[PDB]
Amino acid sequence: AHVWEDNWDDDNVEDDFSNQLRAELEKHGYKM
Amino acid sequence: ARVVQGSPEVPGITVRVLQALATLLSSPHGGALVMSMHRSHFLACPLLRQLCQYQRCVPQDTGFSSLFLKVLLQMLQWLDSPGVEGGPLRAQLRMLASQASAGRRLSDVRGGLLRLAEALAFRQDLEVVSSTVRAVIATLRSGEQCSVEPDLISKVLQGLIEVRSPHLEELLTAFFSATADAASPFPACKPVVVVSSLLLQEEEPLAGGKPGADGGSL
Amino acid sequence: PRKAVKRLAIQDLKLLANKTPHTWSRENIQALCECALQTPYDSLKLGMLSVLSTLSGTIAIKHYFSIVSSPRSSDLVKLAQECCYHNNRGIAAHGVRVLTNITVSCQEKDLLALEQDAVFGLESLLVLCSQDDSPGAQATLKIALNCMVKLAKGRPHLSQSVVETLLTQL
């Protein structure tokens, strides 16, 4: 089993919506 | 803190609570620098301090370790032994640790009766691992093992078999065609843990009739 | 004496322990423990310790410590302690697994020393896996952290100690 079950921070678990957000925001890659 | 390490080792032996954690963290940093080869000249100084403490009070430190701080003592011993294993340079710390382990084993056999080998079992295991030296006879060692088999000494037979296994792993010599046959039936009759490795080693580089010996034994 | 056959026995007792744990009996556990003490080989001891880890995680620990011989007099505890303080990393990982499982599962009067021994060997595994940096080392590390979560949730007594040790490792 994994170390922590309520893990929001994992790659393959996350769904289509903020996958698209991930694509955009990794393309952006900065904050002011 | 190399000078004060020996005094904290006595506090670590008696009561440390968090000083033991600090010393274990310091030793892990030394192991880190040893693995990174970044000039970790700290293991021998703690080893020297531990040896000095053992020479000062062998019975009191061993009693405190094997009685109360078994966990801390085992952790320190595990840190020291893996550190010595990493530091394979010139075996000076290895010889010092072997002497300290022999003295601690004598003190533990003398004093520890109720707390029999709470950590002295791991100490003796590390002692055997470090004392697994290479034999240089490889022909009279078989006769010594045959004599030990009639004498029925399990630990001595295990040590002789472990020595002969490194002896066979070393350069091959001319083995006798009767002594090995006599010794194989004895280690087969006795419950021998290393019998398979011994048979494989003695059958690989064999200066004799291996099929004849195997057929006779069967 | 065949090493491959003994590895078959490992990978088969693992299957039986995973399928039908409640059928495991006290004499079976004791015999396997004696074999794990008398073995010379680190790999086979690792396999037997994995088997004991699975059985300890299951219910059979209550069978082994069901009365009608002290728990300290039981041969399991000595093997678990010595293998948790063994040199080899995987052997130590399975030893601390056995210790964590037995500590959370059974609650007898004399097990407080086992609790202390388990937690101290635990930061031993923390320092070893923290400065090992190997794939197998990280696997044993994740095993140790499973032991942390399970121990702290089952017993809230050791929580402050284990948190401050983890901060020292940080």
From Swiss-Prot, chain A:
One of its GO terms (biological process) is mRNA export from nucleus. Expressed in limb bud, craniofacial primordia and skin. Coiled coil: none annotated. One of its GO terms (cellular component) is cytosol. Keywords: Nucleus, Proteasome. Component of the 26S proteasome, a multiprotein complex involved in the ATP-dependent degradation of ubiquitinated proteins. This complex plays a key role in the maintenance of protein homeostasis by removing misfolded or damaged proteins, which could impair cellular functions, and by removing proteins whose functions are no longer required. Therefore, the proteasome participates in numerous cellular processes, including cell cycle progression, apoptosis, or DNA damage repair. Belongs to the DSS1/SEM1 family. This is 26S proteasome complex subunit SEM1. It comes from Homo sapiens (Human). The lineage of its organism: Eukaryota, Metazoa, Chordata, Craniata, Vertebrata. The gene is SEM1. The chain holds residues 36 to 67 of 70 of the full protein.
From Swiss-Prot, chain B:
The modification Phosphoserine is found at S7. Component of the Integrator complex, composed of core subunits INTS1, INTS2, INTS3, INTS4, INTS5, INTS6, INTS7, INTS8, INTS9/RC74, INTS10, INTS11/CPSF3L, INTS12, INTS13, INTS14 and INTS15. The core complex associates with protein phosphatase 2A subunits PPP2CA and PPP2R1A, to form the Integrator-PP2A (INTAC) complex. Interacts with ESRRB, ESRRB is not a core component of the Integrator complex and this association is a bridge for the interaction with the multiprotein complex Integrator; attracts the transcriptional machinery. This is Integrator complex subunit 1. It is linked to Neurodevelopmental disorder with cataracts, poor growth, and dysmorphic facies: An autosomal recessive neurodevelopmental disorder characterized by severe global developmental delay with motor impairment, cognitive delays, absent or severely limited speech, dysmorphic features, hypotonia and cataracts. It is found in: Nucleus; Nucleus membrane. Component of the integrator complex, a multiprotein complex that terminates RNA polymerase II (Pol II) transcription in the promoter-proximal region of genes. Belongs to the Integrator subunit 1 family.
From Swiss-Prot, chain C:
It is found in: Nucleus; Chromosome; Cytoplasm. The modification Phosphoserine is found at S70. Belongs to the Integrator subunit 7 family. Component of the Integrator complex, composed of core subunits INTS1, INTS2, INTS3, INTS4, INTS5, INTS6, INTS7, INTS8, INTS9/RC74, INTS10, INTS11/CPSF3L, INTS12, INTS13, INTS14 and INTS15. The core complex associates with protein phosphatase 2A subunits PPP2CA and PPP2R1A, to form the Integrator-PP2A (INTAC) complex. Interacts with NABP2. Component of the integrator complex, a multiprotein complex that terminates RNA polymerase II (Pol II) transcription in the promoter-proximal region of genes. This is Integrator complex subunit 7. It comes from Homo sapiens. The gene is INTS7. The chain holds residues 264 to 438 of 962 of the full protein.
